[PDB]
Every structure is written in structure tokens, then in C-alpha cells.
Write a protein that binds this ligand. Structure first.
Ligand code: NA
Ligand code: NA
Ligand code: NA
Ligand code: NA
Lengths: 463, 463, 463, 463
């Protein structure tokens, strides 16, 4: 019973109904103010912002800030993530990652090609296809230039057209016709780009902004090599995604897009050949930084879902997995089921942490995990206070730490200059599992230390 | 310019004015319901509760739950602590610990003896001095019996009457005339009790409930041997505390008390000889458990203030110290001033962490510190999210950890059964200090990454 | 100016001249006594033994015990290794590993095919090719059966005949016509066996015993995939090795062999089709166990030479590398040149240990290195006492340790049952490098603390 | 059945009988050559040297070098230590430390005062008591000046004359009448000196050279406060030591001395008032440095015996304790009895290492132990190769390490400049204990892997 939102207009109408989006009619400068407005919103847990009037381009193209920031909906901080993934506004952290991990066990659903889409109501070709017609947000003071892609999806196919990857990567503006961005060889955009370099031809590309809200989550997900995001999205929502043919390149793009930037990557510069957009386009942005923004609510969250699916595929009894937002997507929490010993009869607590480390180390996501804490599932790892309490009271100050050295996340902060320069540094797995213990010996709180009738009576008096 | 609240009535009238206390007129059972009501309040950040009607004793003696729990006052979660310590309702974590540490550098102020006090308006002697007249709260299902003292102060003097210690220790009820509690030889109540055992005489004692709100904070503070709490309280508030002579023992007690239990500790059982109380007495309780209760807001907080004073007395450039409530008073955070290298020219980051560890290890509080994180003072350690972000992004997953083994806190959770049985286990100091770095290279947030006029303009549009 | 010994007779005549081989004319039982005689010899640093008379087969086939054990030659414990590798009887540990590592930078020398060889003076075919004609030594009480190969070389080619690997692996006798041994898929015998399994044909093989003494050292060496041992041996000695065609299989075998066992590996059982041998054959054995035997003098030694070549190929300033015999080939010592900082200007001591760990982790030999100690080259790592002194006085008891977890050596002793069962466990790199220090501040000994004339004068008086 | 050697002449006559002392009749310079001659002797395991003719003083006073260096006696490297402690020339490492630890459980034996002694046959008083009459050896190039005491004993009493400590401490010559040396407040010479400073009087002292060989071993032993060395020596040998009254100070000195230097320590300079000596005096020296010298054979050895006695007094099942000479007295090895689990039923391997660490940390010797390895007693920790093999094959590369930080040995090499400057650094306890294992699963050697008759038969053939 999914509640898939089919485009950004539907997503915004649902946020509006829950008073979780605010319109700003005063002029906002894309030079630093739009980015600062997004940071204020994340950090104060404000409503998403629709910047209706931007210096330089006026009311032509709106900007959506904090598209999946923490929500203002009372009692539902994950509501933007939940709604983006077609779940109830009050879906829990565990229901979200479990829904994504469950879809990894299902067969991919091929998309369907539609003849027309609102994203092509307006078409700009040749010299008219110029990025100077749209906002060029300078998101942070020290950035190298305007970051045109922070929440949109890059689409590239292999030369034969048999495989297509969808990915969010940062793209910076050079001028009105050119953009640039990194093509890491360990990522899929780079692997596909190498195939176009071997044939000696420019790689065709498309960048879509403001699609249905589920796409940027799956485009952030580190799926295995050879698994298409569009197929996974189809299996996740239980129906085909509708794609439309691009106007100047042989690529299929989401029909739900607000804006489509088409072109070729020269053998790294993106060259714009066409820009298509629906009437009154909206360009979402994501302003990465300290917690909590979409680096944490989308990228780290879908990385936790992928870890949960990989650990379960290795038959480990993992109740849930989560990348705590306060740890800025540097940490993975792995919670084992209460009966993990019955499910894995031959291993001690140290043994199951060794096995988790071994399984995670064989996957694509291992370098992202600066720390993995292994805990019992009486802890909700999305509850900041309960998670800090469990780590402080269950992880020894000296033992239960399994260090590995190898490839590291170059964006992670906890590395020395030498470790960064070598791309070689430590990653740890910390054992916070308890021995078999009665609920009242490991807890001391309202819900764990008082009989049901006493709690009921207190709830009647106070709630 | 202190704003000292002189008794519990004044404290409660100030909480009432800020809508931070709620009266419960329905009957509440001291058998588990009062304790459960206190846990619900802590965990939901509710107003302090005045339980006006208790099963067994009716409206005779009221119970105050969550006397210094987190406050409901908007934007002021530490308001109960701040008001208890005579500070503004909005005093920050740093102003609180800094005010306490500043008083450790001042000369003690001797108390003054008053002839009469409201705590002696009603006097019960002999067979009338029976604890069965007052509530006997069973605070948690598995407790050994009713805990009569969780927030009151125990007063004991040395045989010569030259030195008096005030301390909060748990006291359990045996029957109407007797109570029991531990007398650890490493603590001051035990050290003073040994002097009464050498002379072969029962130690006189007094337990006061519901005093002025500052007393339980200083009675929780692990001050050095030979420093009286009453003298420190006097130096802290900048005026003498008023004491009154006890009716059946040669002891001075706070004139601000709600209830005074007098007696002798038999050579360990407390035997009640007299009970005195003011009209409509209030018996506060503290229901220790998971975060956040007075174990964290008072005991861990005053332990952080004592650590800050000890580190500063060793000439270390410590900006602030704090025991994060989410880590259940297991962790100390030590923040160094930005110019610590100018102040300590001969030490590297590792060197200053070694020095901090050496200084803390020579003090009475070292065994309580399961982990100490050493960080820069651009982090507010009382901000849960910023603290977790700083630890995750600045503490290496492998290096910068200084482990010591020795005496441990027997109540701390992060120890194995063998470490607890030996009383011997690990304590760690973790280095999260950064090399010299520009603000924009170590931060990415609203307040650190945008110019003042851009932030002002965003605040005008959104706040 | 190599001094290559061309067969086992020449090797034995050189040991005889230095009184480093002893003949035992009394009968010795291959059931445990030959193995026990080899252990006594290793452990007491006795001469190599020529067992002239064996129970069951009499004087037909002699056994050579401790072929490369520590030598009795005064002042030359490595003499058997040195002579085996064509070096002077007094070649140092460093000259040995440096000679092997220098040959890794030279082009391979193709062997030459000779028409006849002494190893085919006697030929046994069909039912006559029966292992019951030769000794079947039970080397240790608890072994599964007789180990026929402990010091001989297994020869296998790829189906096309374009690539040949030579390797020492343990082979156990089943009966007179069959033997068995492990074919690990991570080793070359297994990788080549997989190619014969794909075609669905039995893999032809040959096992040679008692070849020229240099062959078992290179057959123990973990060379990169695609580097033939015969080509390396040729480059090392500076001349082609002479091979002869096997009688019943399309394989080339060393013409210097004492015995040649030919056959096919059935898709794991070795089936004997022919046995050829020179008059008065000698079957060498190696009896692995505690230090010091050929596990240490040959396998660990050639593994240190391969590590030295790999570290130098990555441009690291490595003076020498060594696997100390007392650590039973569990440890690698890496010594840096005195001017390593001038050669690697951008790295601290920690940084160069990180780089060494990164380089070693990318190679085939990483899992063998349970511990790597990185030291200065003022330490001779082949001097037991100086090495223990340098580790104790230069490796911090807490810091400078870089742990990695991954594949482990299943034969290494320092792993728990769970780490062995998972094949996953810790390997460490320990930093024992000093800061720049004057010779007299880091040494206190005869050769480092007294002027040249004072030492000369003492040598004149005492030596 | 002790074989106590009563003076240095008897000790030297016993070494002579075993060809373990060599006389050098050629002139040797005390300026560097005597020290270099001692280093050559230690490092080449040469006989002890009697330097009969010294530049400057001729044949007046002989020098004994390497008094307890490793012995030349075949199969008995510890013979000088064994003979010094009244044991058989072939006493094992374990018999030596066990004999010393057994004496710690016996009542002290008061000495006896004799009227005359050979050490007073020649008496120098006033201006004749001048150190320029005796050799002034400059033992190492960079020393601050001549070290007059390296193997002799300093004798000091408390002002009341109720307690006397005997200790070896380095004493440097200033001129003919004055010497200097450190008086560490944590050591006994300093503690006794503080009592003479409180009364405002110079502390009388005596330095004895060339006593009976057992005295420098006990004068090196870190016995508890209040245990006199003379009483311990008496209990160890099972008879009273004979003392003689000093000529110019109220002190008793060993009657077995070669030379007695008497005087007062000025409130730190030793001032010489009298020198007494027996005919043809011998002045022994000890030239500390790299292994192996008396720092290792005496100081570290008696420290291992004291650790063995302290661990046994805490009821730990310790088979033996040893400070390996190759680790330069930086390491303690603690071996547990095979049945330690039966003797300590409630502890795991980690638990017993925690308990050992806790017991050692409460003693005077804890700061000396940079590393403690806890092993099973199937390992002889005095066998260099077996010890290195056991550490490499039984101590995990990552786990089983218990680090403590605290006071360190300022002479130990394994500390950074910051740790030395603070006097604060890490000390580790490493767990090398095995789970219950059959002899053949943990050993592979001649004595452990072959039946008794097979070994007997091999010994008959080869030994
Ligand atoms: Na992708
Ligand atoms: Na106190
Ligand atoms: Na090979
Ligand atoms: Na002493």
C-alpha cells in the first residue's frame, strides 16, 4: 500500500497540507543568500522554502531549499524522507530503511516510455540552451563557483544502451554553456565514462532537477555494479517509472522532472546542447554541511538501507541499520535481533562483530563507515539520546574495538593530513553488545521499569 | 548579582511563574506510581510535579518530582539548574559550570546560627518520631525497599565538632524507626563514620529534605577532603547560610529545610530519634535512571564544574568542562581555549591530552570519568548534536586514545563482570583536538559559513 | 661472481669440507625416528644428517635431514642458506636477502633442455613405479600419514604449456600408487589445477627430490602471478637451468634431481605413473615445527626477500627486510635507511609506517605478516638480541600500532578459534622508528660508545 | 644447602677454578679503556677481567670488570649470578628467582658485629683520605665524569640508628675529596636523607666496594619500605652477615669489603672523611648499556624475583617471573602454573591478566614494567628463542593488551620526549595465555612431539 508522489508538485502539495513548506515572496540572492536560507532552515528545523523571486532571473525559476530536511510536522521529524519514499508521514526510521532493504530482494521493474511529459513543455536548443537564463546559486562563501547540481540526478548510458546509471554528483557551473564535476573511477558515472573514452566519443548526458521525490534518494544509494536505479525504483514503488525520450541525445529521462539539461561530457566538462523545462520550473538545492541536511537524511540513510540489505543477504540477524544524522553520516549503527545467539549458535559477541566487519569489508560501502557500532535491538539508533546512552554505557573504553586500515572516505573529517594524502586510514567496528541480561538489569526508564497498569495510570494522570 | 532562592517555597513560586510546575490533586500511590510519574516527567521534559495527595498519608506530606529535571521553559532546558544555583533562568551550560568553578577560588564563608526556623514548627520526639507518618516511596519495581533519601542532604560532624560534611547518599527505609544506606570508605560520610567507630559511640546524623534548591547541588559535588559544603555554598552565593540547632543532636541544619530527620547511625543502620517539619511539608524525590534526571543535571554537572576548577588550578587553558546528559554522567568533555598553544607553548595535541590525563588521574573524581574527550572550544559540549558531530569528525577511529586502568565507578555500565568484581578496569582520554585550521575549513553551517550581512538578511526574512 | 652448486652431491661435498654433515650408518626408522633425528639436529644446531640405512628399505635410498638448518660452521649460522643460494659460506643475512631482491629487477633467463640427466639413470614404469620401494617417513606422531614431500618441488604446467610453476607443498602418502595434498585456490598449484578441471582432463605433474640446493628456496618464494620460478632461478644465478624431459608426461624437470615422481592429479589425489632416480638416491626431508627449521631459514627468508623487492619497487627507502627465525616466520622486520627522511621528504614516522602498511596490503604476502616492525637500519634484525632490544626500547607500549583485519595465515598461532574459523583476524604494523638522534644518545655498546683507537687497543689486549 | 661465598677473593677463586676470570697484566687506562674492556667482555661473553695494572695508579688497586656478566662456563651462562647467590654453578633461571622469592617469606636474620675485618687493614684519615690515590674510571665517552660507584653499596642509617638501607646508586667523582649522585625522593637513600635534612645535620654514609658477591644483588633489589637488605641477606643465606664498625662514622659496614669510603652527605655532595681498604684492593665496576650487563643480570633479575614474591603473596598461581636480558630489563614475563584455572576458579584469561595488572600496579616496581607478558609455564622465559616464539605465536596482534598510564621509568627507552618531560606514559600487560590445549596441539619440537623411546634412541645415536 505505497503512496508514491508522482512529481515535485504533488510532493509540495502534501508538504503544504501539513504546513511544512513556506513561500518567500521577497527577492533572495542566489549569491550566498539562498544557501544561507537553506542552512538556517536545516539548523532550526524550519519548513522547506520556496524562493519565489531570485535576484537576476526574477520569478522565472523558483528554488526549493531543504527538500528533505528534518520536518516541522509535530512528532514526525522524518516526514519529508517518509513522503519522498511513498510512506506514511509518521513512518519510523526503521520502517523507512526496512522498506528500502526489502526492495533489494525483489526483481527490478522495467520502466515505460511515454510520448510526452510536462518537463518538455518548453524546449531551448542551440544558443538558446544557455544556463545564464536560470539561477546560478553560490551555495557557500568558499565554493569554487555556482553548484548547479546538488539534488538533481545525472543520467548516463553505456555505449550499447544496455545499462543506465542515475546518480547525484556535484556539478559546478563554468559559464552559460559549460559545467564541470568529478568523475571518480570507483563510482558508476566514471566507470561508464571510461567506456565512452575507449571509443573516442563524447558521452551523452542529462541532468534532471525536481523529479518525483523518490528519485534523488535512489540516485544517492550505493547499489551494486550492474543494478539500475530506475529498475530498483520500479521494484520499490511496485510499478514502472514513466520515462520520456530526451530531445537532442539518445537517453530516457524521468517524465516527472522540472528541468532537463541535455548535452555531452567532453573527454571533465559537461557541454549543454539543450535545456527543457515545465511551466514555472522549480530548481531544488541541497546545501551540504553540518547536521542535518540531505547528506544525512538521504545519502547516509540510503547507505544504511544498503548495509542492512547486504548484512541480511549474508544471513546475519540484523534487526535494523542506521547512519545517525548527528554523526554526519560518518557512523553506521548495526542492531542485532534479541535472539541473535539462537540464529547464529556458533559465535560469541566478538565473533559476530568480526563476521559483521568481514561482510561489510567485502562491499562497495566499507570505506564510508568510519565507525560501526554493533548494538542490541532494545536501542533505537535514530533516537539521539538513547543511542548516546547505549554507546557510553555498553562500549568498553578499551576493548571490543576492531580496527581496519584501508581506503577512506576523502570527505570524512576524522583523518590526519597524511592519511588523507595517502587515501589510507583507520576504520573501526565497536562492540556494544551485552551478555544475556534481564530487561530490568539493563534498563531504568518509564517504559522498561514499571508494570503496565502503573504506566497506564500515569499516562491517564499526565498525558 | 546572584538571585539566591532561600527555600523550596521560593523555588516553587519561581517555577510556577514560568509555568514549570504542575499540581496533581488526584491520589498517587508512593508504591511505584510516584516514581513512574517522575520518570514520565523527566523523559517527556514535563513540568516538575507537586503530588498533593498520596495513598496512605493523604494530603499531609506532598512530594515534589523532577525538582531539577530538564525544564519546559521555552529555549531554557537548564532553567531548573540555573534557578537552583541563583542564576538567570536562561543561564547557559558554560555560565553554570564557570560560576561553580569560580567559587572554588574564593575563601569559604562561615554560616550563621539562627535561634528559630520554619523546619522546627512541628516537632516529633520519641515514639512520635516515626517514619510511618510520612510517604515511603518504592521508586522502581526491583528496589530493595523504599528510598527515603534521593534528593535530601545527610549532615554529619567529626567527634570534635570542627568539621561537617553535607552529602546526598541513597537511604532506604527498614521500618518506622530505622533506615540503612552504604558508607563507602572512599567517601566523606564513611571517613567521618570511622572516627565515631574508633571512639565506640553512635554517630549523630540529620537528613534534611526540601532545603533551598542550591544545597542538593553542592551536597552532590565531589569537593576535596577538608572543604565543607556549607562554606562553599556561602562563598558561591556571597553570603552566610542560616543554620538552626537540631532538637535531639549536637548538629546544625539548614533553616530552609522542609523536613529534618535526626538520629544516630549505629555501629549500617540510621536510627530515628526525632523528626521536625514545617507546616504542609514537601518531600522531594529524585528517580535515578536513564537520561535525563538529577544524576545528570546535578551530580554529573557539579562533577564537571569540579573538574573545570581542578584543571584550571593546574594552569591548564580549559575554556569549559561538561558531563553530557545523554552519556548518563559517564563522559567528561574538556574544551581548550582557541589560543591553548600560545598559553602552553611546549606541548603538542597529544602532549596536552597526556597532561590532562595526568592531572585528572591525581584527583578524587578520576574513577568517575569512563571517557574524557578533549576538544576545541568552537564546540558547545552541552549541544548534543554539535558534540556528536565533533566526536565523529575529529576523533580518529584508531589513534589519539590514552587508556588507563584502575579504580572504576561501580555504577558505570561499560564494564565486564570481571572488571566489576575486581573494581579494576579501563578509563580513556580521547583526543579530538584539531591542528590550527581556518573557521571555514573546520565548519560548514549558517553561523560559520556566511558573511554577517547575508545572515542578518536571512534572519530578517525567516525568523 | 656466483658460486652456484649444480646438484645435491656438490652441496653435500661442500658441507663435508666444512664438517657440516654427519653420516649415520646405524639403522634409523622412518617411522618417527628420522623426523626426531631432524628435530634434534635443528634444535641443537647439529650438522645435517645423512641417514644411510633406513628400516624397511635398507641402504637403497638415503635421507638427508636438516638440508638447510642452522649451520655448525663457526661464526656462520646461515652457511647452509648462503651455499644453497651460491654465496660465500659467511654471507650475511642482509647480503642473502639483498641478492634475492636484486634478481627480482632482472629479466628472466629461459632454461635449456638437455637430452639426458643422472635423475633418469634408473626408470620405473607401470606397476614397478611404486612408492613402497622408497622410505615413507612418519615425521611427527600426530601426522595423518607419511609426508613424502616436505623439501622437494612440485612442477605443473598450464594446458597450453606456456606457463610452469615450481612449488614446495606438503604431499602425504595414501598407498604405493597414490598421494594427496592441498590445492589452495589462492596459490599457484590450485590456480593451474582449475585450468585442467575446466578442460575435464587429469593434470600432469612431477615431484623432484634432492635437486641443486637453490631450487627449494625459489620454490618456497611467493613470487607474483605469471613469474616462473625457473626463469627467476636463471636470472638469480646468471645462467640457464638445465631441464630434462619427463619420461611419461609432457613436462620439463630439473636435470639435477635425485628422484623424479611423475603422474597425474585426478580431479585431490596424485597418481604415480613413473618414478625415475639417479644411482644411490638421496631423499631430503624438512621437519617443520618450532624454530629453527626450513620454514624459517627458507620460506620466511625468501618471503622477507620478496617483501624487500616489493617495498623497493614502490620507491620506499628500505635498507633491509627480514623474517626473524625466533618469531617462527610470523614477523617481518623492515629497516629504513638512515637518510629515509631525505629520500621521502613529505612523511613523518607515522606516515611512512602508513605507507609501508598500504604497500604491503596490496601484495600476495600481506596475510602472512602477523606483525611488521618498522625500525632504523642501525639494528641488525637477524641479530636476536639486538632486535629484541630495539623492539623493547623503541616501540611504545601503547602507540605507533596500525592494525588491519582481513585474511590471515591459517597456520599462524596468534589467532583465536573464531578468527581461524572465519579466516578473518588482526595483523599489525608497529612503529619503532626514532626521531633524529646522535649515535651516542641511542646506543651504549663497545662498537658505538668508544673512539676507534680505544676499541683497537681493547681488541689487541683481549681478542 | 647454600654455598655462600664470603668475600670477593673466594668468588674470584671459584671463577678461576671454572676458567671464568682472566688477568690482564698490560697497563689499561681507566680513561675509557677499562670501560671499553668491560663492554667487549659483556658483548662477547668473555671471562670476567682482573685489570692488574692501571694508568696513573699502577698495580696499587686492581679493577674487576664484568663481575656478574654472562659466564663462559659451558652450558652455564648464569653461573656468575648463581655463584654470587650461593647456588650451584648450573642453577637455572627459575631456581635463582625462586630462591630469592622464597627468602621474602622468611623472618630477617639480624647481623653480628665483629671487632676487626680485612677491609680496615689500611686506614686513610683526614688529608690522606683522598680519592686521587685510587683509579677514577671514565666509563663511557659522554659521561659527566668518573663513575666511582657502579657495583658497590651505599650504606645510610636513619638519625635514631634503628633502620639501615643498603643500595647501589651511581656516584660520580667531583675531585679527590668530593663525589655526587642523585637522591630520588621515591627511593630509600632519598627518604633517609630527608630525615637528616629535617634535623639540619649532614647524613653520615659509607660506600663499600668488592664485598661478598651476594650483597650487590640484594642492594639492587627493590624491597618494600622498612625491610633492611642486611636482614634479607641474612634470611637468604640462612646465617648472620658479619659487620664491622666504620672508623669515622657511626655505621656498620660489611666485613667482606675490599674498600670502604666513609664520610657525610652535605645538605647533593658526598664528602670523603676516611678511606679504608684491605691489602691489594680490588675495585669492581659495572658498565651499564645494551644487553647483557649487571643492569640485566642483577637489577632486572632481582626485580623479577621481587615481582614473583609480590604476586605469590597476593595468592596468584605464578610458576615463575623473569626480566629477559635481551629486552634490557624493560619487560617482565609472568608464567602461570598449568593448573592456574583450578587454583583461580572464577577468572578467564583476561580476568587473571586484569588481576595481575591490579596487583603489580599497587607495588613499588610497577613503573619499571614497560611491558608484562603473561604466559603459560610450558615456556621458559629465560630461553630467548622459546620466549620470542611464544610471544609471536600466542599474543594476538590486536587484542589481549591492557594499557595503563602513569609514572614511568625515566631510563626506559620506549617513551616520547613529551612522555619523559611529564614523567607520564603508557605501560602494558599483554595476554599470551592459551585456552586448555593438548601438548601436541601447542608444541612441535623434539622434546614435545616424539615418544620417550624414540627420543632416547635419537639421543643414543647423536649426542
Ligand atoms: Na549509480
Ligand atoms: Na562531602
Ligand atoms: Na609458484
Ligand atoms: Na634500599
Amino acid at each position: 500500500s505505497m503512496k508514491r508522489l508522482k512529481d515535485l508538485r504533488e510532493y509540495l502539495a502534501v508538504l503544504e497540507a501539513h504546513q511544512d513548506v513556506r513561500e518567500i515572496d521577497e527577492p533572495v540572492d542566489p549569491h550566498l543568500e539562498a544557501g544561507a536560507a537553506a542552512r538556517w532552515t536545516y539548523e532550526n528545523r524550519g519548513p522547506a522554502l520556496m524562493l519565489n523571486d531570485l535576484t537576476g532571473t526574477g520569478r522565472f525559476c523558483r528554488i526549493l531549499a531543504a527538500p528533505a530536511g528534518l520536518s516541522t510536522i509535530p512528532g514526525s521529524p522524518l516526514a519529508r524522507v517518509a513522503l519522498s519514499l511513498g510512506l506514511d508521514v509518521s513512518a519510523t526510521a526503521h520502517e523507512i530503511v526496512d522498506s528500502l532493504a526489502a526492495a533489494r530482494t525483489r526483481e527490478p521493474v522495467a520502466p515505460v516510455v511515454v510520448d510526452s511529459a510536462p518537463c518538455q513543455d518548453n524546449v531551448l536548443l542551440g544558443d538558446d540552451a544557455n544556463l545564464d537564463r536560470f539561477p546560478a546559486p553560490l551555495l557557500h562563501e568558499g565554493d569554487g563557483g555556482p553548484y548547479l547540481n546538488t539534488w538533481g540526478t545525472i543520467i548516463v548510458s553505456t555505449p550499447d544502451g544496455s545499462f543506465t546509471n542515475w546518480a547525484i554528483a556535484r556539478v559546478m557551473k563554468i559559464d552559460g554553456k559549460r559545467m564541470t564535476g568529478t568523475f571518480i573511477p570507483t563510482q558508476h558515472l566514471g566507470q561508464i565514462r571510461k567506456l565512452w573514452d575507449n571509443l573516442g566519443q563524447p558521452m551523452p548526458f542529462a541532468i534532471v532537477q525536481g523529479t518525483e521525490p523518490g528519485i534523488p534518494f535512489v540516485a544517492s544509494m550505493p547499489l551494486p555494479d550492474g543494478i539500475e536505479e530506475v529498475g530498483f525504483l520500479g521494484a520499490y514503488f511496485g510499478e514502472p517509472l514513466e520515462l520520456v525520450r530526451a530531445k537532442t541525445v539518445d537517453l530516457l529521462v524521468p517524465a516527472s522532472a522540472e528541468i532537463v539539461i541535455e548535452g555531452h561530457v567532453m573527454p571533465p566538462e559537461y557541454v549543454v546542447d539543450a535545456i527543457t523545462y515545465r511551466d514555472d520550473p522549480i530548481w531544488p538545492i541541497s546545501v551540504a554541511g553540518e547536521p542535518v541536511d540531505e547528506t544525512h537524511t538521504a545519502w547516509g540513510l540510503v547507505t544504511a538501507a544498503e548495509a542492512l540489505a547486504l548484512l541480511r543477504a549474508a544471513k546475519l540477524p540484523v534487526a535494523t541499520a542506521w547512519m545517525p544524522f548527528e554523526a554526519a553520516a560518518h557512523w553506521l549503527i548495526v542492531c542485532l535481533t534479541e535472539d541473535w545467539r539462537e540464529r547464529m549458535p556458533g559465535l560469541s559477541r566478538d565473533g559476530i562483530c568480526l563476521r559483521i566487519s568481514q561482510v561489510l569489508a567485502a562491499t562497495r560501502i566499507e570505506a564510508m563507515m568510519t565507525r560501526v557500532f554493533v548494538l542490541d535491538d532494545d536501542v533505537d539508533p535514530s533516537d539521539q539520546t538513547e543511542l548516546a546512552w547505549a554507546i557510553a554505557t555498553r562500549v568498553s573504553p578499551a576493548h571490543g574495538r576492531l580496527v581496519r586500515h584501508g581506503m577512506i572516505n576523502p570527505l570524512a573529517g576524522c583523518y590526519s593530513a597524511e592519511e588523507r594524502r595517502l587515501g589510507y586510514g583507520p576504520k573501526a567496528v565497536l562492540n556494544g553488545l551485552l551478555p544475556p541480561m534481564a530487561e530490568r538489569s539493563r534498563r531504568s526508564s518509564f517504559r522498561h521499569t514499571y508494570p503496565e497498569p502503573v504506566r497506564q495510570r500515569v499516562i491517564e494522570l499526565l498525558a
